[model samples]
Target chain A: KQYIISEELISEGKWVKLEKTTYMDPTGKTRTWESVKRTTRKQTADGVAVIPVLQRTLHYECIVLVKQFRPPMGGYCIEFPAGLIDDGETPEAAALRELEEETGYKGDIAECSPAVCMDPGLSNCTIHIVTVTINGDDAENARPKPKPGDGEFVEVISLPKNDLLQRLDALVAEEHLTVDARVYSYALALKHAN
Target chain B: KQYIISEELISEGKWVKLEKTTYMDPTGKTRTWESVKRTTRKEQTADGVAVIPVLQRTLHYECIVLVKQFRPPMGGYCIEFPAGLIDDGETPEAAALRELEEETGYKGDIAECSPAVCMDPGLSNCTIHIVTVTINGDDAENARPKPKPGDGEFVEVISLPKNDLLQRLDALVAEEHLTVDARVYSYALALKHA
Candidate 1:
């Protein structure tokens, strides 16, 4: 749908200095691309992925969500205990590691599959919904303190599954959650229950 | 896992182009700016929209993918009825119509949600997947040849869903399928049966 004729360097960097050209919708159009620094990026097939790490099948008592603030989106929000995959680590393996590292709960991952996520065009980042059954006691092993590599902190909160889903939307409205991720998390709960 | 920086460009004819500078890779590689032609673009997300479009789903059937592809690393060669986001000028709805007509021989509005495609990141570029339980016999009347830009052919012959999934694997190798789509199709199947 897009036709990029060509591009020439605008600048090089400590910061990338380059002249990039593209024929997007003639100005005055809606867009999904976000300006991060000097480049506009998007997830082309953006989708959701939920990780249900199970220690003893307690159903994730302490659901870990990054409570950090994202200046780009202009707010703080919650997301599945997820992060960018480490180089060479598959998304599945990344999901597993991110869950444990973020939530601080060691659980066996039963299944890891594809999921739909928000930001369809720009972030074409596919989410991997991981399922695991953990032990109730592990939930108390240690409270998860999320230090997701960037400049933010994630706190794991122990909430009842039913109650959590009910408050999901409200949380987003209050800017306590990301709207798209709200659906993704809820789907995880639903999938877990099933 | 992939740190790709990009810029866009517009050509003479309303065409769009995306130029990517793949730096910040896990490997900490040097700046490598690449260009990708935009086949389609659309506006996604409620906030700022993105230039991504409903892509045409490519259907591969009756091909050797139905006969010999297999992977011991993952499992079976498996049945892959993979599809993708449509190109520009298309709605997710219209894209589905084109795909069904081309692949399975069906038509009409595909039921939204439920059995939706699960995007997988571990395996392929499988961006999206949408499926429905029952195709109303009524659509039989709507069955007809698609328009000019329709997908032309497939080696796989069967049309029944059972035949597609119940007893067959894609004719292509897992590595082959994994390359283009990052094995999104394989991961999508996990969502299908999960």
Candidate 2:
């Protein structure tokens, strides 16, 4: 067990804050750790990520993804549809909204994972992983009209569900795009399953 | 196409730094984004490494090593694979092995290494390489394992059945009230699909 002694804010940015925390380890040894936190974290979670599965037919399934230029990455990144959760909003609601906003496809939340941290060693940001089901046969979904927020330039891409790993590799090789860990790991797991 | 115009340092800490980047979006709109970066980042190298250690007991029986520790950013205990920042002049594979041995007392061989994956591209430039380690359960060093976590680090090692990983994680979350890392959760989700 560990107990925190004190936390000091090292720096504050528009969307991120850096803090230093002093704590006592189980061995009674004093230690200090540095962490970054999101300033827009809401009550339930910091954000929501949607795994949108499109079902046009029983044998045809696709996953909706987004491509955008990430300033931090210094390149375009391929990732699942995601966004910060709003105040007083649930993860499920945020996932649906983000999915439609980024991909222009309305989806139904099938299930949601507990709040999970992406970079636990670096940041306190946590998000819920929501599995969404989209009816691709619907006329509304045939031609999605994405409405990305200001400064958000997202390109929607749909790929065959079973061919994600290869498609992602092709994208990286051909377009010089990076993949998010969450998306890559998921694709890797699918390959392992085979 | 999007291009960065200039990046200004906002604040600097011992381990982290904050910067603001002004860029032209694909739509020809000027935008500014704030991002956090690790000061220890090396050129063309991952800043951190996470090892997924698999202990093979039999053809059908295998387990993966995990670690539980209190994260200052989360203000709670998080269950994650053994991970550490890359040391100076160290390869990500070497760091993976070193961190695995130090945290779990398990000597393993690297079976596979994933490409560099971004953790939180929206907020930070942190990237980590995921290494899969194969630990033969019949090894002599596996008889009686002993972890040697450094002072100020209190990590509890856990061995979870690979096939039942998702359920085990769910149980830990429900009963132990521990948060799960997105990487771990994504792996478990992949296992489910497999």
Candidate 3:
């Protein structure tokens, strides 16, 4: 009646140094609580900075496969090579960069499709599609921006679009992502490759 | 990178205190935060006295108005009977009990649907339903002490089964009650009502 909030230090975990928490109560009054929040920041749509971040502009994602130990899922997951918006970079650039760095698959946006990565409840993140323009003529220009590569690395899997679809649902069901991202990825598969 | 927990307080023109916080940054870093929270302990849960207080379940609710003024297609907007979730007080029953007192126009659960919103993800944590049940005449004799007079106040606004058919969409499109989009998806034909 007087005030409300859910306050809790759920687990001894943090996110980017900020831990994960479950807030079951906010204030002292019965049934009142404020969840463990990451400290809400004012995201103003000022056409720059935060606005672009909140904007749902589509970007291309290359669903990739790599074998690694995933403790949570207790196995490997075959999924996209995705990353964030690099300063001064568009969705297309970031996706392409992520693809090359993680898979060395110098593919450009194959096709741009409608997409969104997050909903308002979880985080202010969204994504779309891009068609990569694989360049054969610009070998020297695109030549892996030579970084002293990890001496030990291997890229051993590449599945076609349809095959990727078959496994996508299972990955999501296992909680690789919530239904929203699952729905988005499914849409991209049908929209572009189909 | 060095691992640590940092603090960022979000104030709605005031201070926000919690026993803990979790923040995840774009860099894949995780941290857990416990803070100076505001609550009185001594709660009764299924597991006996817990960090949560049982008494807080039904803290009276204020007839708060949740009106978001969207300067979109039309400058006008919509609203809803400010609904809330239950906290502390081990049982949702307590929250419902308190909510009843605050809603001068409520007819209890019979007045509307409990979990009526169903699986609409938008209002996932927004509510955990509770309703007032009816007892036969004989059962009433064996019933526990009746609630205070304010227990059944305001019959004019207290709608029974009629409110059970609460059409969220109708409430917006027609009733001049509420018109918003976040929960609009469920407003489709024969859909869940939030």
Candidate 4:
């Protein structure tokens, strides 16, 4: 592993920045690399995140999923209920808020992972993932809905866990659909499930 | 799923770009969202591919193969899936195979692949299609592949038992002071394969 000798800012923006960092590799050679990072002082700060607010009434354990067009992919992606953690909010609080705002389902956090880095090679954005369950009273009247002008147009869908991967498999056979790795990951977890 | 009305590119760059788009949401609300993107060298468009190779001997995974490299953006050694940009006219499946060979020296077959995914929908238009590869029996011996230095990059192949992934990753974060890539660290490694 290399050791960082020093870092210098090359450019700055309100949300992100570019920097040049020099480090010594395994050998004694020193090298400089340019990097982009989010403009946040807290590298360990936990932020917006959650996944798998499951409903068991639906056959084979149904999951709350959202299909929205991600501009980056030029296509819609199937993902679990999630969003950014607002300032002064805990990962659990953000998960609950996003679960309701994006999926119209009020849920409680059952388990959560620490806010983990998203794409370390590209950006510094990180998020926490939680295992949540939809409230039964709210499920009586709640429907999957995402607010407009959060700038997200989300379509909520409930599917049996067993069919998640098959849906992607069939869709991939016919057309392009970007499935978020977290969602596909949930599918994989279900696959190896006993 | 709502149909795509149109797409407009607002800006471009060598590695990334910014874009603005108009689309009708599920509620029929016409909205606009601005997003950044990561582009391939040839097309200059923000679309790319990646892979996650899982090597196994029989029922139990002999070890999962990964690469530790100094990613410029993060300015640290990143433990992640061995990945690369797909060549123009290449399929994501083919790209995964080639990258695994070049980076890890392990020839693998596509066991399955998740549909293309936008790793971070809110940030850049960076899409990484995840291919789940199974290393061939004959290719097992070459599992611990190492990246040669001075090839414009430095990488060390890491092969560990499926269960120990998260524990070691924890050490990387606490001691090695490395940040783990989400997909690689989150679901792919978080889940116990055996």
Candidate 5:
């Protein structure tokens, strides 16, 4: 996330750029496709990040989620703690760092899947979706305070593992919270866990 | 989904654009941060959706059909549920069926559809609706070679037994390599190979 120093719109210091690419198809047809490229930061060459799901029990009673406003969508969204993997950092390292930075808790990855592209057709942004487990007691005091940096407001919420689907359903259906794909899909996978 | 095509490059006509946006902080302080906007396709078309095609011969899922395509963004091959952008004024369900037919030449019906999900809240405005599809006994199209030529977006068609989904993913990891998308991969884990 880029921090703003002044009140007005500032040019440059931006993290993303676009490059138009022209390629010849198998039938000698010319096609133009726009590609998103990360200029300021490139950890996984094209682009890579991590999705860290914090859990406290075997069935995941205390599931950590971050809710914040996204300007592009012009609304608040619910998602897992995630961040871009910086230089010299492994996917696991990035997961741990992001989890701590966003939620102020330390937990080791229980399982880290191979990096997957978030939007293969639109952008080159890929992320390693990781499952992290925290101890039961430790998660109880895992900093409920809101300290989302850089002019951000993030609420760290925990859903009861047994009622994961019900709680997430309420958040989306009643609260009208925008759900991220990773979180929604994960919840679906855990639909019958309770 | 609405698709907006612009040549003026308002936000970088390519894949991504970054802007320093200012908003009120938690403490009522003004904060500005760089936000990314993916411009490869403008507007959330009614069609940006994916399908989890299940080949049902047994009570449990027999084999799930997946697609393989070389995604330029990830700089490698991506193993994903069959997905595609929506056509003009097409329903997401129709889009899913059309993509399944076009990519793999198999026809199926949607079992369930999820609400639209923000693919990456912190980064882009891309959203995708995932719909589960079930193909019964007589839905196989083994004679047609994938993918439809001239409009080729896929390189190969893959089918894996539900019980061996993880093993197949691991096998691909050692070969052409599989970059699983979070939405698809996470759901597979939750499905428990069923």
Candidate 6:
């Protein structure tokens, strides 16, 4: 099995750091790889993304999503409500908290993924994808209003779960918004199911 | 709409670079965000390709091709789809087929190609095209395939049954403690939902 021999810090920033790693391959050859690491990972996982399933009625179900300006992409990205997990926070707890904080609708965690790495080739940012169920009939969920924190400009959106792929495509094409891979994959799954 | 005003180089490595982007928010607020960018991105459409190769053994029996490798960023072995960055002037479809063959020794036809999707929008400007490739398991060439991984690359190919993919992934996580990439997990989850 290949194993790391040493990792040297190449650069550092406020939130992320770069490292140059040296490892021995299976063929007894030494190789070097450069990767990014997040400095803010203090929990089991680095972050949580909530897939809020809002059940308004027996026949009406919607997926709660958020659109916000992502500076890295240089444009607004339509993604699920997501945020970094705080210190000592469980993935389920962080999912509910981020769901409410970004969309103002509290939900219960139905399923939470194990630690999953995004872009493993480039960075070590792991996140848990939590599926949450929201009771729209409840009084607390009647009037949903986002309370995004300072400097966070988020727009809440709800798309019908039945026709999410089509709606997402139209929304992206019409509004010129980029879709997150996780959300798009889920939508593709739904389409595949049909 | 939020838009990027300028980007200043914060740090540079051989494969990746960091930048501080100043952008104007929709609320008339000026903010700066630090992000990572890949230095090898030559295509305007996508940086890489993630191939979901499917092999149908029977009408009801099918398997998905995956690769297990020791990712430097994660510092552990990860189960992921056959994927790689697109070379200069190479289309995503070409990259998908090439990577799948090199990593898993599977020759498949591109069934579907998704639009560009952001992996980690908040941390990096990385995007990839998810390509679905279909393979006939009864074919002669695919019958005792031998992978041809490049030098210094130690990858193990895995093919999981298409049925109950989520359950299979869970068992792998429980028994082997292998890290699952988000793209692979999402596909499994999608299959489960479907």
Best by TM-score: 6
Chain B TM-score for each model?
Answer: 0.41, 0.95, 0.33, 0.77, 0.79, 0.96
Full ranking by TM-score: 6, 2, 5, 4, 1, 3
iRMSD per prediction, in order: 13.1, 1.4, 13.7, 3.9, 7.6, 1.4
Task: State the local distance difference test value for candidate 4.
Answer: 0.64
Candidate 3 is scored at a TM of: 0.31
DockQ of 4: 0.40
For candidate 6, lDDT tens digit of each residue in A70-109?
9999888999899999898889999998998899998988
Tens-place lDDT digits, model 3, residues A1-194: 12222233333223211222222222332432223222322221101101010111243322334322222221233333443454556656665665566555465454332222222222222333333444433554234341213321223233333344445445445634322222222322232220
- Which candidate do you rate higher for lDDT, 3 or 4? 4
Q: Candidate 4 lDDT, tens digit per residue, A1-194? A: 56668877765655555566677867778877655566654533435656654654533656678877775455777777777566677778878888777876767777666546677666656777677876544554354454534556777777765676677666556656666776665566446333
Deviation in Å, model 2, residue B61 alpha carbon: 2.0
Model 4: per-residue Cα lDDT over B28-79, one tens digit each: 7776655555655455222555566666765665466788887655656677
Off by over 4 Å in 4: A1-34, A39-46, A135-150, A171-176, A192-194, B1-13, B20-32, B41-48, B58-62, B136-150, B163-175, B188-194
Which window of ten consecutive residues has the lowest lDDT sum in model 2 chain A? A185-194
How displaced is residue A84 in candidate 2, in Å? 0.8
DockQ of each: 0.04, 0.70, 0.04, 0.40, 0.38, 0.72
Candidate 6 stretches greater than 4 Å from native: none
Per-prediction TM-score to the true structure, in the order listed:
0.44, 0.95, 0.31, 0.79, 0.81, 0.96
Residue-level lDDT tens digits of model 5 in B1-194: 11112222235443466655655545655555555565445444422888878776645556778887766554556788888776657788888888887887777877877778788766666777777787774544643435562253535788887666766776787776557776777766655512
List candidate 2 segments past 4 Å from native. A58-60
* Per-model CA lDDT versus the true structure: 0.35, 0.86, 0.29, 0.64, 0.64, 0.87
Candidate 3: misplaced stretches above 4 Å?
Answer: A1-75, A110-115, A133-156, A167-184, A187-194, B1-194
Overall local distance difference test of candidate 5:
0.64
Instruction: List, residue by residue over A1-194, the lDDT tens digit for candidate 5.
Output: 11112121212345655555454444455555555545555555333333444444455555778887776555778888877777888878877777776777677667777767777765567777777766545744455333445645567777765466568778878877778887777676565221
Clashes of each: 80, 0, 54, 2, 7, 0
